[PDB]
Amino acid sequence: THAAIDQALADAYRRFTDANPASQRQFEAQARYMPGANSRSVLFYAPFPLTIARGEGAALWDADGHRYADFIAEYTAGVYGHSAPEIRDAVIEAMQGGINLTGHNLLEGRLARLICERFPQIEQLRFTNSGTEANLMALTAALHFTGRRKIVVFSGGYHGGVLGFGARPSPTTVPFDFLVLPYNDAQTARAQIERHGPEIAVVLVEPMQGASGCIPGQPDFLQALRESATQVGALLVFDEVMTSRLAPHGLANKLGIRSDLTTLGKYIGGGMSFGAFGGRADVMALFDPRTGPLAHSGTFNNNVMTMAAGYAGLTKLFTPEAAGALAERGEALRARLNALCANEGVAMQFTGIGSLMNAHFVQGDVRSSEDLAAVDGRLRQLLFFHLLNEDIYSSPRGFVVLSLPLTDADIDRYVAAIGSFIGGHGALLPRAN
């Protein structure tokens, strides 16, 4: 199928290029001032990325005027859609009270309380400006609290712009003392955490890996991390920047597993810049300016616009009930997609939990990024371009994200588009056994 796939992809590039001349012009101009016209690597794809001009609800428009149903929703940050009035009105009201207030304010405590109550494993928290900052601070807290240096993470793990892992840390990863272990391998985790126990400050893990392909952590593996971390005296940190959305009180609570710290981000700030870290009060005490040894400084951490937007979103829109309902809608979609793939006999599946899923061109159980390392990326590209042709805006990597305004008809369009993808590319796709 090698040559045929190359040809199909060349055809797709041509069709995309011809359909999007304003986006191509914009790309060429913008490449003068930013490398590859780009400020967030995931937003770039070949031959050039679409410029997005406008959004409303779960609709996006590109520079050439195409309207799409949005199935990516700012990589899970955009759970409210692009134009929620509750969010916009909260931000406008905050701005009318004054911004850059340079002190403790009347909004930060409301959002802090809400988060501690909704995610009770967070006894106290502090706000950051990103998920990346939240994870850096959580790691810093654990190193100091334990007096140890080694940090256990998992291959495929993504914790932010300077905290990413393959078998080894990514080229942009901060040089902490990382021990990188295989995801969903409880035996190796127990053995290695025991071997290095007295040196391990922290075990940092996503309860479902996001960036690596929506790969659920198996309960026996996640429990092994909790058991081993407690055994050796390390802190367990759950990175729930993505997974906090997956159940009314997040995925760790759904699983009944308690981490010492938890990090949050993306949608929790109402669509605005946001992160948070929190957990045990005795660990968070390190940052109490009255008595603790650690400073945690930043400029925009408690900004009134983020505080207002986050509080409005979590109280009026993405409530605990709404999180559960969106999860149910996502489970139904993933089941339909997997049934379709199986019925058609193709080696294609969708992995994930609830409102988050990812297309993969492999058969069998997907338990780690290793199971996906051989996937033909040209097929992911063909899928992406096919979806654009079917008026659906997805991610190049095949990550599908539900948001609140997405209609049942929109979801039907996605399933139909996968059907037409399989129907039209049947000669190119790997066959199931």
Next chain:
Amino acid sequence: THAAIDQALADAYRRFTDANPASQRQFEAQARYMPGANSRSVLFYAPFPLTIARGEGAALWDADGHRYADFIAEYTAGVYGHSAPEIRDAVIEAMQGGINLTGHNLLEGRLARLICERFPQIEQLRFTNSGTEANLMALTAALHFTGRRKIVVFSGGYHGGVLGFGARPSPTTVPFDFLVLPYNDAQTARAQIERHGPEIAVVLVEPMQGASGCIPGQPDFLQALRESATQVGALLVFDEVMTSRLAPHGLANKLGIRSDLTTLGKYIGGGMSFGAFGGRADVMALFDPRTGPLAHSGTFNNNVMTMAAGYAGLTKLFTPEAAGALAERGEALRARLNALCANEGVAMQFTGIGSLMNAHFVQGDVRSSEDLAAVDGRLRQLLFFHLLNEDIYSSPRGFVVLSLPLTDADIDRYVAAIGSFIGGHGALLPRAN
């Protein structure tokens, strides 16, 4: 004297407490959910910080209704004041077009171009969500570009929440291989950079240290850094997160010293969450997704609200011309204050450049944080509380920051308040000689 200062401080605490019961109530309530009720360490001060309820122009109101002239302006981020309609209208218009757009957009390129034009040592840039992230990325870029690991920084250096230095890296500082050298010591800088030449990836420095107390970098020292970095093959990185506002095209341009990379933050995002790193196109090429080996990820980096607010602020309000004019007003103020202190014979002075200055209770030249090691912190507190009594909201650390809405009358009131401070605390303040 020592006993009398303790007494005066106890009195100030009591008066502050009695006058601010709503702020005290708010602090106690919020301390349940955030350590010390706090999310940004600099905002905490004893006995408890004021809650800020409202801002308009260069005025702030606390929870108990006290109105202050604002002389801190979000630690330089708030150069536009608290309610600039140009900023608010830009943000509103951006929100109306849709947020969380999940792609390259129509606003990021405009702001990138504007910044590159304003600071021509920046050939290309990428946006981040904070100054801390910008510095992390600049360092990461330099390590990869050079294939070296050692990073030269300076005592008292502040580069963000996980990049702070006293004589040694602060407890929260990421464990890069830092070599910490004395600020404003040209001879030591040349010797140590040359001695460790082959190991040094980067020399990272503020052209005027901000957090350590508005300490100008001397021409001989900064030139020694440029020369030494070039000699050994290291990159020079200027952290202009604060200093970019100090002249029409930033401090480094005024001094005529070209760094290989420059980091920016605070006011450049129009008061919204923001940072940027940029410089030589060949270094920034590491991040071009078409060809470069480095990813730079981050959810909110190119968000339309920041892109809109930044562009509106820089084009309509804080233009290069406005930066020059505000710097002139600041120079005039600093000279007035220094003349007053000298005339009164007190060991008190204000250090800095242009629109940024800092009170210090020390006599003689301030060249590094080491010169401030024996200062009595209780005197800074007495000043802070005195200024509150005189309807002036300042920083506990004595950092004074001009913003655009401040009137000449507001500035006169600051000078008068320092006059009344010296007049009323004569017996308590150290003498010049």
